[PDB]
């Protein structure tokens, strides 16, 4: 067979230990899920420094905690805009997930609170910026570099899926790089507890699995499809399916055809053909052997999964960091005031936040 006795025994034991870890992690998650924490700080506890990002519902700002001097990333959501954009459930669910999960590649929520106007989630500041920026600047990542990031996503999805959480929002724009060069996942607006199937059309065109496009009930396998897209994009510099307009992207996604750069290794192409598999009965991550089909694939043969989890592997790339509060890896935005109303807005809708 492919493994001799020692290697087979070691692999079997490793896989059983993963099961044991995940059972404990699920028990811990469910405790925090059933008893979420609230109201752990206030706005006047922080100095606002710079806007790190903006969206249709709010902003993320670099802030400095006055008492400790620690920097944090503060997501500010305008309650009235959240209601107008039909994002109440997503906002409450994101906070509930963030306060309940615990994993080295998932951002840590340190404080949350609300006022008359806004909701606030204060997260660890991840100073390396988005993977997206580094990828577009460098062009493409070499296979070992792509593999280092991919391994972290595999472990993170293995963790999330054990909690019955589907992620649904994977893309380089949503992956931040920390001071040690490891990945942080921050956005949970589309994540959902799904033991069986779910049906919502959500995601980003290039990263949508065929079954989402085709309006099917779908499961956690969409995240493994998205991993395939991510690995391809990291290693090529562009995603597998692109076009001027989303409709044409969707036609390519559902076609069952994918083409690869000539510099992709055969091991990489084999992995990608099994992740970017339109047939759900054949997609890696969706078979009887679960995540092990991915973790045991030849492309990952050099990956020490425990060392990645322990953050003991030297990162391929360390973002520039001139000190605490350095924002050089983020875009520049116009700075707007944080207006707080004299009257409470949308109190009922956000009572649980």
């Amino acid at each position: 067979g492919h493994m001799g006795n020692a290697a087979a025994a070691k692999k079997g034991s490793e896989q059983e230990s993963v099961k044991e870890f995940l059972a404990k992690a699920k028990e811990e998650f469910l405790k925090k899920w059933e008893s979420p924490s609230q109201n752990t700080a206030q706005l006047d506890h922080f100095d606002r420094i710079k806007t790190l990002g903006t969206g249709s519902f709010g902003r993320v700002m670099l802030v400095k905690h006055k008492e400790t001097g620690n920097h944090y990333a503060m997501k500010i959501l305008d309650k009235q805009k959240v209601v107008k954009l039909k994002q109440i459930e997503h906002t409450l669910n994101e906070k509930r997930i963030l306060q309940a999960v615990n994993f080295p590649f998932l951002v840590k929520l340190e404080f949350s609170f609300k006022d008359n106007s806004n909701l606030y989630m204060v997260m660890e500041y991840v100073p390396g910026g988005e993977m997206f920026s580094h990828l577009r600047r460098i062009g493409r990542f070499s296979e070992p570099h792509a593999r280092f990031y991919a391994a972290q996503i595999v472990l993170t999805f293995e963790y999330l899926h054990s909690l019955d959480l589907i992620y649904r929002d994977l893309k380089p724009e949503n992956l931040l790089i920390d001071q040690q060069g490891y990945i942080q996942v921050t956005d949970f607006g589309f994540a959902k507890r799904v033991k069986g199937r779910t049906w919502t059309l959500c995601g980003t065109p290039e990263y949508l699995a065929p079954e989402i496009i085709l309006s099917k009930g779908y499961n956690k396998a969409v995240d493994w499809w998205a991993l395939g897209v991510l690995i391809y994009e990291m290693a090529a510099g562009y995603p597998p399916f692109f076009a001027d307009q989303p409709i044409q992207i969707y036609e390519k996604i559902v076609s069952g055809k994918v083409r690869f750069p000539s510099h992709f290794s055969s091991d990489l192409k084999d992995l990608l053909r099994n992740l970017l598999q339109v047939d759900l009965t054949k997609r890696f991550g969706n078979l009887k052997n679960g995540v092990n089909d991915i973790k045991n694939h030849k492309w990952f043969a050099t990956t020490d999964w425990i060392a990645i989890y322990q953050r003991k592997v030297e990162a391929p790339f360390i973002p520039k960091f001139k000190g605490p509060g350095d924002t050089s890896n983020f875009d520049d935005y116009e700075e707007e005031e944080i207006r707080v109303s004299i009257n409470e807005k949308c109190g009922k809708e956000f009572t649980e936040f």
């Binding site: 724009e173 995601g203 562009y238």
Partner: peptide, 18 residues
Amino acid sequence: TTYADFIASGRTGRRNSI
């Protein structure tokens, strides 16, 4: 080339959700 096709797509910047 495929890279040129990617540039031609106009979808080289940050991509929003649908």
